[PDB]
Design a protein around this ligand. Structure first.
Ligand SMILES: Nc1nc2c(CN3C[C@H](CO)[C@@H](O)C3)c[nH]c2c(=O)[nH]1
Ligand SMILES: Nc1nc2c(CN3C[C@H](CO)[C@@H](O)C3)c[nH]c2c(=O)[nH]1
Lengths: 277, 302, 265
């Protein structure tokens, strides 16, 4: 039943691509642009002119848009806009674009970026983390969109481009924990995540990764550490010199600002990478 | 659907606002919602006879659900406690009954539209996970663990009520320091000897009491007390902008030791120490008067 | 909902109790329900011979959805199988008034570093992860006629049943390793990540799978005793991935263990 919708989306996208591009357009990569990476749009070449499809006109895409064009010589699709389970969408609805795009038969790489809170005590706002594993906490309970998910060669390629491009920004390697949201973590929650083996935490991405793997794609995933998760116990009522409980708290404003500051380095890394998938 | 939810919150507020205006000769503007936990219905005896209070059964308020337990249907009580106008939630909806989390926290949204409440005082009963806690101690909650929320059972799931609060809510500042200081000040003023710890409350769905491994898991995760309520209400109150004071009564000590091995010469019987509802109730009843007096003092100073 | 679930449980019992009374010359009052997990449906062959057994397809039983097999096993009358509806069968069979033991077997991944593929783990505790979050067989209105609203699970795995299992393993001279440990119920996949297996271990998991616990909880809610046994089919890896900078022997053994245990209850 949900397959007719997947085929309708494919058919609509297929025919728009035929009408738009002189030559056959077969994207090799899907880039999902998380928080702050929307401007990767500007890396798409003006010739041949891009195709931009609003989600509102693609069957099943529950705003956001798809951008088909050439980036650094490579035909790609950009997802500018992502769907998150805390919005009230089912995980199937969240990964519907991947399954639709998979019917083009040409994508074999998912490059996904997100913002994330730093759980590892050595991470700092402004670092990046190349994801090499994950913990799917909602999946623990059976929320699923449908064995090493994070392709080693693509991770090596990412670090080789950091070097080639002389980007000084730190890129850690570690485990991303997917939690539902939309709250930021309590102190005890973040300490729990740390002891669980979490390096960075966010509210997206993992269902996309799992679906991409199920379609046979390779996956490169990159988190922008936008904030350092508060882990210290809160001020005690017996403290005569307490740290105010509001100090250091996470805000969406901080997430937007720091993802935008890291955006240019991330855009340059992805631009270099896509030419060599 | 958010519009169905708005219409039904709007509707409950009209009913309540109209009943208040019809019943009280001066405008009734409560400063706190007090949610009475298990065994703590006695808090309602601190509502003064004059001015006469208003009791609204959940049965009659649009959008309110009735608890599955009989005959505890649940009611809001609007009155004066220690001269301060309050609203009491006598009874609560707990999610293990079959209610969605949105249904359990709908009363908070509806009451928020009166435009006067800025404090949630929430009480509960809880199992002791921290080894130093004993049945009969209180725990002032200063942090929590929302493991169901992490895993997809979250009261803010869905479209955001942008007229109430932010899409993305921090919870590292959930438990107001000055209210916890005020609680301890009233324990002092009242010469209450019962312990009041500070620690971390974890919400689990229930209705089973924890297995040993589950309790050990909650402990290593940082839990000091465990219950089946409260965190969704705190989160929603925080979303509305309220300050929160939360107070657990430790009604039982969770069983964390590994069960007897098939290899144990004198085995501890696996049923020794098991939680029961009746233990929880009778220990709540023992501590109710202290909890009642603490809240009665607090409300005159918020 | 509760009232329609009650009615379906009653219809399933009514159907089963009739088909039993028509098929067996004498009353069949099973003492045990044996749930045969993934790879262990060979207990179906160990059932006695005389009186020649009763098989009901799930398709035929009101409200179900596999088959229910009623017959004698090593001399004992038993019933074999192979969320609130996942446990519908246990409640229906409870209404016969004779079962007081669930024997549940499963295949599970090894999380305890000491466990090796092919080992057995007798379950003496569990972690019900979905049940902590909101997927729980007892969610909803309580079945007051079956058991309590708030059920303790610190006593869920009977010690005598476990002592009994360990005796039968010696008696049959089974060399297979058998541990005692904690079973974690998850709704994930056998595509668990390394980081997830790492998390399960440090959370206290000895073996992980996707079955058993909802049945254990429902049977305990009915007052039954529970024996649960896992077959470790594989050793989950917990090591992190590479850095960018750098068998029917088991089932046969479980049959004989169950066959032998079924007698002493
Ligand atoms: N859970 C979580 N997610 C994030 C994110 C990632 N997303 C950023 C946005 C909130 O600013 C949500 O979609 C979550 C950044 N920082 C954090 C954090 O501290 N915690
Ligand atoms: N999970 C949990 N909750 C409680 C509670 C809180 N509620 C009390 C009531 C059981 O008597 C349920 O609503 C849970 C008291 N003790 C415990 C405990 O040991 N465990």
């Amino acid at each position: 039943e949900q397959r007719a919708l997947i085929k309708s989306a494919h058919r609509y996208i297929s025919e728009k691509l035929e009408d738009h591009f002189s030559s056959e357009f077969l994207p090799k990569a899907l880039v999902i642009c998380g928080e702050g990476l929307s401007g990767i749009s500007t890396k798409i070449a003006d010739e041949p002119k891009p195709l931009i499809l609003s989600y509102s006109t693609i069957p099943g895409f529950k705003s956001g848009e798809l951008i088909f064009g050439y980036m650094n010589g490579a035909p790609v699709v950009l997802m500018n806009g992502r769907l998150r389970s805390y919005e009230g969408h089912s995980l199937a609805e969240t990964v519907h674009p991947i399954r639709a795009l998979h019917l083009l038969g040409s994508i074999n790489v998912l490059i996904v970026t997100n913002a994330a809170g730093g759980i590892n005590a050595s991470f700092k706002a402004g670092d990046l983390m190349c994801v090499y594993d994950h913990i799917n906490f909602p999946g623990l309970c059976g929320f699923h969109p449908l064995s090493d998910a994070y392709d080693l060669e693509l991770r090596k390629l990412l670090f080789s481009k950091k070097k080639e491009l002389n980007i000084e920004r730190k890129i850690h390697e570690g485990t991303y924990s997917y939690v539902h949201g939309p709250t930021f973590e309590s102190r005890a929650e973040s300490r729990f995540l740390r002891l669980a083996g979490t390096d960075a935490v966010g509210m997206s991405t993992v269902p996309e990764v799992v679906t991409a793997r199920h379609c046979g794609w390779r996956v490169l995933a990159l988190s922008l550490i936008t904030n350092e998760c508060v882990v210290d116990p809160p001020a005690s009522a017996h403290d005569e010199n307490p740290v105010p409980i509001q100090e250091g708290k996470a805000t969406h404003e901080e997430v937007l600002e720091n993802s935008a500051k890291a955006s240019k380095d991330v855009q340059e890394l992805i631009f270099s990478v896509v030419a060599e998938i």
